[PDB]
Amino acid sequence: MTPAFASWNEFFAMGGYAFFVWLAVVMTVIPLVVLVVHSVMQHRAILRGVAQQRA
Amino acid sequence: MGMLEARELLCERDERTLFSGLSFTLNAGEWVQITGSNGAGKTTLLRLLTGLSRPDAGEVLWQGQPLHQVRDSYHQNLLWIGHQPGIKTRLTALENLHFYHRDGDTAQCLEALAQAGLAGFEDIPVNQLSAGQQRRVALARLWLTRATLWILDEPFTAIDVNGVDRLTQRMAQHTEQGGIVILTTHQPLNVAESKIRRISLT
Amino acid sequence: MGMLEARELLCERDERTLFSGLSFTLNAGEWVQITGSNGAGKTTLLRLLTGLSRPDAGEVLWQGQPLHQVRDSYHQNLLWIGHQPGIKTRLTALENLHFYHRDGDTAQCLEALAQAGLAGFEDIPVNQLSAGQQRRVALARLWLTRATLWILDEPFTAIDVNGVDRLTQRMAQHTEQGGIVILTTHQPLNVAESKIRRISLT
Amino acid sequence: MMFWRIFRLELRVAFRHSAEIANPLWFFLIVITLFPLSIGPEPQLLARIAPGIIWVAALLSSLLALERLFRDDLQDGSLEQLMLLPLPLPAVVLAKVMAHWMVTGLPLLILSPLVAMLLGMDVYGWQVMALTLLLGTPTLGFLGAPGVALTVGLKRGGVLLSILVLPLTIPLLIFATAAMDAASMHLPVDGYLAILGALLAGTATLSPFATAAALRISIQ
Amino acid sequence: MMFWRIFRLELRVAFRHSAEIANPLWFFLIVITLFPLSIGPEPQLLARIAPGIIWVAALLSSLLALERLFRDDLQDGSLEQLMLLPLPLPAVVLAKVMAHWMVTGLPLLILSPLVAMLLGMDVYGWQVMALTLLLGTPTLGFLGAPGVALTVGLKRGGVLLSILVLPLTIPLLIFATAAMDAASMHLPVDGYLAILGALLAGTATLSPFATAAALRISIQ
Amino acid sequence: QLAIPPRLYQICGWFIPWLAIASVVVLTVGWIWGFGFAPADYQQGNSYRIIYLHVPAAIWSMGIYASMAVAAFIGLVWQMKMANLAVAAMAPIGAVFTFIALVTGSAWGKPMWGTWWVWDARLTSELVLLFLYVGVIALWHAFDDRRLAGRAAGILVLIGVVNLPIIHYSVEWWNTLHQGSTRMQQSIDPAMRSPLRWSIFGFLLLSATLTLMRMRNLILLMEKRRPWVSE
Ligand SMILES: [Mg+2]
Ligand SMILES: [Mg+2]
């Protein structure tokens, strides 16, 4: 209903140190997504390898 | 009231059950050969018996107690010679047999070497000795030790046909008095087959 | 005219003359066994023949030319497996035979690993395998290689009777077509002694 | 035969899995960070002892890898790359050493941008720190191979065999660590760097032959 | 089978393995020599960086020497010690560690007067350096024993062993450099040696048991 | 109550969906009620917000290595093969959290320090924590045979957990030696702790889901040669 910010991305996403905050955000999100996708891809590749072995 | 025993031993290499539910007892004066092919876990079974490896199921019972309780009164009565001889190949031939003898040394170690077949190759570095004479350095301990349980892993690796008739003439006396020898060899044993108790991995 | 014809070889390891005046010729289609004892220079003669070592006197004369000269048209016609198998103890057997093959086919390598005996062990690292099977991996390079000269040092070191028979049968087809095989084994060969030339390490 | 097959073999035996490719990177990072914990967090002080730090790390990695260059092969398979493989023994040795670099030089080359700023060096402290850790790192393996061959291959060897592996690298470290000094003062290295190229061209031509001779003498 | 018999056996074996127990000493000497010339003839800078570089070189030399603590025994007589010698395996590991220190730590400690004289360290500085080397290198051996015990079967040498053992030596390095830097201005230094003796006792009453378990795992 | 069969795969299979559906509804209230509703401080302005990306990534950088101590203690003295695998399941996650903590600390100090990298106690401690995690991971991915790499990793984890307080309290004093002072004072402000507690609790849930997912991948990586995986 009422934020601690004021307006759109001219006000938000720019606190005077925008580069540092949005670089920390980027390098926090990217490794976590990498971990999640890596776990999912192995959880599927194990079954693919099992299907390969079933011959 | 038997000596070193087994209690439903089982081992897994993650693809095959090498042996399942092994249960065999060894009283005093037994000549035992671990019969099997080249893929069976005979080496693994021997390492389980020596205590180096831990069984995946069941335990090994020595004299009534497992091998983790009595691990000091059992190593005294033990002699294991694996595929690797276990000798530092930088020292002389006699300096290796000097480490494995308690007392009365430098007068029986040379005697043990002479009875093993290494007459004249005493003060020579092991690395300078042949591949079949390096095994003889380790096998010379059979004339020194006072152990009552010999677990030999492929004793006849590169021994000449003369030496084999001395190994299976010292062993036939050790097992005659009170000893227990556990062989695993692929060469046929010259000694009569009415003596060796052959057990297969079941 | 004629293959390896080592003339007047001389070796003086330590303080003993292992062999003096050993001038022998190897014609085409020769099965030969180096007869000696455990301690003789049977491992040194087989390393004076492959060019790994150098004789103290005389020379080994391959195909009528000194071995150190050509050394390029002779290493493609030579197969030497020594006391140590020579296979890396971390890679799988299939990778090792992929290396040692001169084509890198991964289809004849599987055939070789299925003729030697390691059916199902083409993806287990050789260290995880047994001790006899590690030697069988190295001896599996007898159906792959097309080199008409084999110098085998202690082939039947830890191999069961069936594998020994398979190897003795494999060497029975090599040595009539164009093959030449040199052995140093302490186990008598099952083949009749009429097809084996025995060289005494004089 | 197939020099490149030997190179691929050594690479394969170096890294069994894709997760061990980063092991040299982590080792170099640990070695680099080991120094500030002993000297202090001073940025201006660490910007002058940086050449010594990085070259000590590189020498340590090269020494660590020269053992698995030859000693491990000696036990079971080292007479096969001499008896078999009809290509000349120099070319048999060369592949191995050029794999050695790809275990000790390439990880450091890749980590160069990171370690040129952890220590506190400038942009010109990385241009000549890259064309000194690429122009001289292979040379380390080339002149360490002949000494290591005799050291870990010749049986019954004395302490006098220890002056054949390490001491010959000193005139390399005399130049390299004195080359980046010209980067500290912001002056063109040029000559003191152009003489490392002569070392590379005079040690990539006579070291394989010397190592082949050393192996032949050792096995004989 | 007795403790002293194993100690004497390992001392005898290590001497015939010469040209490999002298490489760490040569590395120590080269690292100690390189830096004074790299930074040129600067009294204050060299005097400030000496306590750190000395212990960095000592740690690197100890790491280089630790590669042979159990490696050679694995291919042969790594058993005959677990399997025999009713003396408990922690005692066997203790004998191994003490022999290794006699072959590695003591040679580093014995040339300390020469190193102190070359680096300009006064008599008090040499005394503090010797006192921290006497209590520091046994700590290095006890800390590196579990790592080499785990790595011995792997023979992934150099990078892996370093990654395992180097982070565990951080407090030793930090307190040793602090103790020597406390001797620069000649202020009394005894509280910094207590933190070394206690840590030595802690790593000497807990590493043999951990190394025994590591060896048991590696053998299987 | 504990007779672990190969049902752990089917046990932590009902708990991955709901612990991932509810691990993003707790994070997006720990990152939206903060990062846009929490007032900024005076000294740092609108940069006192990397708290939610660095503090939850530092508390759970050591909170997982202290959880691998239990996962190695239970897997050693009681000799459990499954629980030992937990040591290898939480190591990459802890390493990623330590790396994220380093990155966030570097990005948070750059406005004030002036350079990306300065050696601080709260930062060098996380660096050596990353080194220990890397050691665990490298040791695990070295053995060709399983059921041995797990025990080696457990032994190393126990050694590292023993050494962790000593290393941390030695770095805390090494910082006092040279620098002699601390950068920021311990203050969080009242209406900035609840949005940070929410984020800490959310990071706790994300790590649990990630380690369950990695445990389901490691069970099938050792039990792939049994008829149980016929499905
Ligand atoms: Mg065997
Ligand atoms: Mg021989």
Residue numbers in the entry:
A (entry chain D): 1 to 55
B (entry chain E), C (entry chain A): -1 to 200
D (entry chain B), E (entry chain F): 1 to 220
F (entry chain C): 7 to 237
Original authors' sentences:
The cytochrome c maturation system I, consisting of eight membrane proteins (CcmABCDEFGH), results in the attachment of heme to cysteine residues of cytochrome c proteins. CcmABCD represents an ABC transporter complex using the energy of ATP hydrolysis for the transfer of heme from one binding partner (CcmC) to another (CcmE). Our cryo-EM structures reveal that CcmA2B2 form a homodimer which is an ABC transporter analog. CcmC which harbors the heme-binding site is attached to two CcmBs with two coupling helices TM4 and TM5 on CcmC, respectively.
